[PDB]
Amino acid sequence: IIAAKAAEVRANKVNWQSYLQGQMISAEDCEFIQRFEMKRCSEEKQEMLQTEGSQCAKTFINLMTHISKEQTVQYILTMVDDMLQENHQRVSIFFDYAKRSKSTAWPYFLPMLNRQDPFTVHMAARIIAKLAAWGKELMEGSDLNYYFNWIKTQLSSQSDSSQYVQCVAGCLQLMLRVNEYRFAWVEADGVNCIMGVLSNKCGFQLQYQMIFSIWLLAFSPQMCEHLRRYNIIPVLSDILQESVKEKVTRIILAAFRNFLEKSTERETRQEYALAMIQCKVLKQLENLEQQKYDDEDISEDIKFLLEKLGESVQDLSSFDEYSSELKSGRLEWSPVHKSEKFWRENAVRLNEKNYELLKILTKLLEVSDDPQVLAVAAHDVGEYVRHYPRGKRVIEQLGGKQLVMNHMHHEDQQVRYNALLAVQKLMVHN
Numbered sequence: 305i306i307a308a309k310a311a312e313v314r315a316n317k318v319n320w321q322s323y324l325q326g327q328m329i330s331a332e333d334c335e336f337i338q339r340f341e342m343k344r345c346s347e348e349k350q351e352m353l354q355t356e357g358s359q360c361a362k363t364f365i366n367l368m369t370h371i372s373k374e375q376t377v378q379y380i381l382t383m384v385d386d387m388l389q390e391n392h393q394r395v396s397i398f399f400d401y402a403k404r405s406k407s408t409a410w411p412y413f414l415p416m417l418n419r420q421d422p423f424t425v426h427m428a429a430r431i432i433a434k435l436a437a438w439g440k441e442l443m444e445g446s447d448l449n450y451y452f453n454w455i456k457t458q459l460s461s462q463s464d465s466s467q468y469v470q471c472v473a474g475c476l477q478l479m480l481r482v483n484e485y486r487f488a489w490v491e492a493d494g495v496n497c498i499m500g501v502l503s504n505k506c507g508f509q510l511q512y513q514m515i516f517s518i519w520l521l522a523f524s525p526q527m528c529e530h531l532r533r534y535n536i537i538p539v540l541s542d543i544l545q546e547s548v549k550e551k552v553t554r555i556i557l558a559a560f561r562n563f564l565e566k567s568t569e570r571e572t573r574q575e576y577a578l579a580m581i582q583c584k585v586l587k588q589l590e591n592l593e594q595q596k597y598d599d600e601d602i603s604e605d606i607k608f609l610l611e612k613l614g615e616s617v618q619d620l621s622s623f624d625e626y627s628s629e630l631k632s633g634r635l636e637w638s639p640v641h642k643s644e645k646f647w648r649e650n651a652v653r654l655n656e657k658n659y660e661l662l663k664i665l666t667k668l669l670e671v672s673d674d675p676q677v678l679a680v681a682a683h684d685v686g687e688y689v690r691h692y693p694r695g696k697r698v699i700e701q702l703g704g705k706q707l708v709m710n711h712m713h714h715e716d717q718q719v720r721y722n723a724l725l726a727v728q729k730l731m732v733h734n
Contacts, residue, residue: 305467309423310385313378317341320367320376328370329363336363340383349387353397361401365412374421381427388434395438409435410447417454422464426471429454433475442484452492459497462506469506473513480520490527499534508549515540515555522562529568532575536563538583545588550597557592557605560585564612577616581639586613621646623653630664635680641687651692662688662695662702669707679722682708686726696730705730 320341324334336352336359343352353360364380371377387394402409413435416428432451436443443451458472476494479485489495498514506514518536521527540556547553560580567573580586589610597603619625621643629638640646654661665681665688672678685704688695699705708730711723 305464306423306426306471309378310382310427313375313382313423314386316375317379318373318375323367323371323376329366332359333363333366336360337367337380346390349390353387353394357397357400358404361398361409361412362405368416374419374424377419377424378421378427381424381431384431385427385434388431388438392434392438395435398435399439399441408441408447409439410443410451414447414450417451422468426468429475430471433478436485437478437481442482443479443488448485448488449492452489452494456492456494456497459494459501462501462504462510466507466510470509470513473510473517477513477516477520480517483524486521486524486527490521490530495521495531496534499536499539502539502543508547508552511543511547512549512552512555515543515552515559519555519559519562522559522566525566525568528563528566529572535579537576537579537585541580541583541585541588550602553592554597554602554605557602557609561605561608564609573612574616574619577613578620581613581617581620585609586617589613617643623650626650627661630661633668633677635668635677635684637676637680641680641684644691647687647691651688651695654688654692655695655698659698659702662698662704666699666702666704666707669704669711675716675719678711678714679716679719682711682719682722682726686722686729689726689729699730 320334320337323329324331336356339356340349340352340360343349364384368377368380384394398409402412410432413428413432417425419425419428429451455472455476458469459476462469476489480489495518498517502511502514521531536559540559544553544556560576563576564573567576589606592602592606593610617639620638621640623646625638626640626646629635629640635641665684668677668681669685672681685699685708689699705727708723708726711719712727714720714723
């Protein structure tokens with residue numbers, strides 16, 4: 305509705321001389337606003353901004369401050385945003401006005417977000433985002449903190465409300481366009497509020513814009529490293545199936561690619577990929593690969609994520625990491641457990657150190673009260689039988705045969721299921 309409101313406001317001009325008669329503004333301010341209304345061509349606008357640039361933002365701000373009429377307020381902000389859409393360099397006029405006034409441009413506009421009209425405040429915010437992104441000065445300090453609090457509160461509301469939160473999210477994206485503003489945003493907890501809104505399941509455009517924000521943050525190593533705490537991957541794994549829209553799918557895949565690209569360490573990239581595989585990203589990546597799309601960008605994102613997921617599972621399939629998991633007791637369905645490639649080649653290696661890994665498994669098959677650990681141990685005994693035929697006597701000696709034959713009667717459905725599988729693999733031959 306933002307464009308429709310903009311057009312309605314462009315039509316809804318009002319006599320600016322009324323405010324001069326009321327002495328709410330200066331005669332020069334009224335003159336500038338009327339002259340800019342009539343100076344519609346690009347050359348005329350350039351002439352106005354170049355000859356009376358000091359008067360320009362002064363006029364806008366004076367009228368905005370001293371006039372209650374939301375018609376005029378929205379008209380002023382619509383004109384400014386139209387100027388910035390025609391040529392986004394126009395921020396220079398406002399910056400020059402502020403510098404000539406011996407101040408920065410923000411205190412003049414941040415209080416304006418306290419006004420009532422949603423259109424007024426949200427096009428004001430759009431103009432602030434344009435100014436911050438395309439300006440030379442960095443948003444900083446209390447002004448930036450107040451703007452972050454305002455974006456936070458407006459986002460938390462999650463429809464006309466949603467269509468204005470579109471402006472809110474677009475302003476946040478424009479801010480994050482700059483690396484330093486991304487650092488400031490991470491200093492703020494606004495990403496947690498982003499995740500809160502996403503959990504609240506906002507509309508399609510808002511979800512797309514928020515994941516666009518995440519992609520902007522993920523472009524950097526430090527913020528990628530520090531924002532892990534929000535467990536982005538599972539929520540977006542489910543959203544990539546629910547919110548099918550191609551823009552949404554593409555932006556999640558791009559965010560994942562940025563995460564894996566800019567994660568600081570090999571171990572860091574490995575945490576991200578391990579979370580993705582535990583959250584079943586890889587299967588949907590295969591499905592998208594079966595699917596096709598009209599640009600090489602989505603193709604490259606899919607291929608990169610596919611290759612790196614494959615490499616990550618290969619790394620997880622290390623027999624050393626399997627030994628570490630067994631030693632720590634973390635028998636919790638790591639991909640190495642269901643990686644047949646590891647099993648077929650390394651089943652003999654479990655015999656090392658006088659069958660230390662098999663002893664760990666069998667000991668857990670009597671010590672474990674944990675359903676997950678017990679079922680995993682039973683399944684791994686089954687796999688050891690399946691992939692090292694000579695190990696049947698070893699498991700007999702270690703008692704795994706009888707332990708699984710007992711745990712088939714375990715109180716837990718999953719433990720019974722895995723133990724039954726293992727004992728079935730056991731009795732296959734004389």
